Amino acid sequence: MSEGGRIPLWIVATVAGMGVIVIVGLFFYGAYAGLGSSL
Amino acid sequence: KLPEAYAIFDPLVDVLPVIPVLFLALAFVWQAAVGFR
């Protein structure tokens, strides 16, 4: 169904939000490892 | 290092300090669930 409301917006927000935190976290990790780490 | 008996728990000890931050973030999950009413 194209039916809106089927997945509550708060769950979408929480999960997308954690997705962002994870991706950004990986990018910070990368600042200390491999290329760009100074090491 | 922690006393060696507790060593198995090192990876958990490493994440603990961030938990208080997850509480602030939790306030927002919650508020989104009561529609920021």
Binding site: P8, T14 | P11, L22, A33
Partner: peptide, 28 residues
Amino acid sequence: IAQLTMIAMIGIAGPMIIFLLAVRRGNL
């Protein structure tokens, strides 16, 4: 892996409480 698993478990817990209470019309 051990660190990322603790993290995912501990992190899931907060949203789990909200999700559980929401599901059972709790006092949110």
